[PDB]
């Protein structure tokens, strides 16, 4: 997936392989092997072939791929881009209002009289009133380096769809 | 050799006790009057005259002329130690608040002292300032070829720590210095707090500084 770094429904190598299987008609032979009672020793192998055919897909999305899905997904992509962009703009404005409208080196320091520092004296704050408006006592800190044996597990896959023609073929299969 | 503590005490004696009959015979203690003015901050610069010092200790004048920087420091320290006896803007506000915290001597020092040279010393030309006169008070004549604009020279830098709310001070002597970064106070070091220091130009002592070049007539 460094080289197959491919977008939502661009045909991956696996998609092209499945489409080649469809065009060659070997899917019909796999169906014959699974449906026929005469050669059931190959049923385990054919199960393995089918399990390797379906890897990106999940059944709930696959069963709903009607013939008119392409136009729907065009409009859905435009809507998703619109909401993503609006969300990013909102996040940008929250960050912009968090910091001040003066430049970074515009100095000035404050004392919060009612708030003890880690010592006995009151805390001296340097990042401006706009950072004090929503004050947090970990603004300047970095995260901790959790060790390797303590780190949480992560997802081995992300849901790129296969190409729509391949999705139609897989639904029919 | 010298016992600079005894020298400081003798300097205190001179400053306390000298009088010169100014204003037609009023017997004014000139340095006591100027000490009152310094203590009240109505005066900032004190030009002590070594001709006046010669009238009760020529040996002290010789020691000053031979080791002038040391005695400049000693005279300044004696004056600062004597200002409360005669104590009848922004940095003043900061010194007031630091006194409130008490309730950095060079920062709290808000005056300056200079030696007006003795008349026995002939005014040299620039060429006659030999290497034997290094560290010694000399009088030099010349034409002022060029003068720079007045610039602020840091005397005592003042920092504030973000994590522990403590002020730290850094006296400056050399023409260059290392600005402090991480907080040295033990409440930061022992707690490994990662607290850093921000220079406070408002609450740090600057001084007017000017570079010029004299030239021979
Ligand atoms: Zn600190």
UniProtKB/Swiss-Prot annotation, chain A:
<feature type="modified residue" description="Phosphoserine">
    <location>
        <position position="109"/>
    </location>
</feature>
<comment type="subunit">
    <text>Monomer. Homodimer or homomultimer. Component of the circadian core oscillator, which includes the CRY proteins, CLOCK or NPAS2, ARTNL/BMAL1 or ARTNL2/BMAL2, CSKN1D and/or CSNK1E, TIMELESS, and the PER proteins. Interacts with PER2. The interaction with PER2 is direct and via its second PAS domain. Interacts directly with PER1 and PER3. Interacts with CRY2, CHEK1, ATR and ATRIP. Interacts with CRY1. Interacts with CLSPN; the interaction is required for leading-strand replication. Interacts (via N-terminus) with TIPIN.</text>
</comment>
<comment type="similarity">
    <text>Belongs to the timeless family.</text>
</comment>
<protein>
    <recommendedName>
        <fullName>Protein timeless homolog</fullName>
    </recommendedName>
</protein>
<comment type="function">
    <text>Plays an important role in the control of DNA replication, maintenance of replication fork stability, maintenance of genome stability throughout normal DNA replication, DNA repair and in the regulation of the circadian clock. Required to stabilize replication forks during DNA replication by forming a complex with TIPIN: this complex regulates DNA replication processes under both normal and stress conditions, stabilizes replication forks and influences both CHEK1 phosphorylation and the intra-S phase checkpoint in response to genotoxic stress.</text>
</comment>
UniProtKB/Swiss-Prot annotation, chain B:
<comment type="similarity">
    <text>Belongs to the MCM family.</text>
</comment>
<feature type="cross-link" description="Glycyl lysine isopeptide (Lys-Gly) (interchain with G-Cter in SUMO2)">
    <location>
        <position position="26"/>
    </location>
</feature>
<feature type="cross-link" description="Glycyl lysine isopeptide (Lys-Gly) (interchain with G-Cter in SUMO2)">
    <location>
        <position position="13"/>
    </location>
</feature>
<protein>
    <recommendedName>
        <fullName>DNA replication licensing factor MCM7</fullName>
    </recommendedName>
</protein>
<comment type="subunit">
    <text>Component of the MCM2-7 complex. The complex forms a toroidal hexameric ring with the proposed subunit order MCM2-MCM6-MCM4-MCM7-MCM3-MCM5. Component of the CMG helicase complex, a hexameric ring of related MCM2-7 subunits stabilized by CDC45 and the tetrameric GINS complex. Interacts with the ATR-ATRIP complex and with RAD17. Interacts with TIPIN. Interacts with MCMBP. Interacts with ANKRD17. Component of the replisome complex composed of at least DONSON, MCM2, MCM7, PCNA and TICRR.</text>
</comment>
<comment type="function">
    <text>Acts as a component of the MCM2-7 complex (MCM complex) which is the replicative helicase essential for 'once per cell cycle' DNA replication initiation and elongation in eukaryotic cells. Core component of CDC45-MCM-GINS (CMG) helicase, the molecular machine that unwinds template DNA during replication, and around which the replisome is built.</text>
</comment>
């Amino acid at each position: 997936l460094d080289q197959e770094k491919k977008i939502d429904d661009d045909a991956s190598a696996h998609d092209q392989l499945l489409w080649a299987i469809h065009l060659s008609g070997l899917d019909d032979l796999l169906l014959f092997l699974a449906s026929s009672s005469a050669e059931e020793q190959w049923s385990l192998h054919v199960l393995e072939i089918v399990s390797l055919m379906f890897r990106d897909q999940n059944p709930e999305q696959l069963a709903g791929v009607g013939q008119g899905r392409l136009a729907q997904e065009r409009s859905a992509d435009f809507a998703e881009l619109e909401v993503l962009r609006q969300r990013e703009m909102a996040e940008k404005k929250t960050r912009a209002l968090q910091r001040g409208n003066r430049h970074s080196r515009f100095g000035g320091s404050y004392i919060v009289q009612g708030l003890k520092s880690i010592g006995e004296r009151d805390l001296i704050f340097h990042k401006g009133l706009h950072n004090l408006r929503n004050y947090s006592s970990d603004l300047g800190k970095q995260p901790k380096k959790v060790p390797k044996r303590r780190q949480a597990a992560r997802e081995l896959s992300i849901q790129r769809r296969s190409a729509l023609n391949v999705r139609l073929f897989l639904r029919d299969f | 050799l010298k016992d600079y503590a005894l020298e400081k005490e003798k300097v205190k004696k001179f400053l306390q006790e000298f009088y010169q009959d100014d204003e037609l015979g009023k017997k004014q203690f000139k340095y006591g009057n100027q000490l009152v003015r310094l203590a009240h901050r109505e005066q900032v610069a004190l030009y002590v005259d070594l001709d006046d010092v010669a009238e009760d200790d020529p040996e002290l004048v010789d020691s000053i002329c031979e080791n002038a920087r040391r005695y400049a420091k000693l005279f300044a320290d004696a004056v600062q130690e004597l200002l409360p006896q005669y104590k009848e803007d922004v940095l003043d506000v900061y010194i007031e608040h630091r006194l409130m915290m008490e309730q950095p001597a060079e920062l709290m020092r808000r005056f300056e002292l200079y030696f007006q040279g003795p008349s026995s010393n002939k005014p040299r030309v620039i060429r006659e300032v030999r290497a034997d006169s290094v560290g010694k008070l000399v009088t030099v004549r010349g034409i002022v070829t060029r003068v720079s604009e007045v610039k602020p020279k840091m005397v005592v830098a003042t920092y504030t720590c973000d994590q522990c709310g403590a002020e730290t001070y850094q006296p400056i002597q050399s023409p260059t210095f290392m600005p402090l970064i991480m907080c040295p106070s033990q409440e930061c070091q022992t707690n490994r707090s990662g607290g850093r220091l921000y220079l406070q130009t408002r609450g740090s002592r600057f001084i007017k500084f000017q570079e010029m070049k004299m030239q021979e007539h």
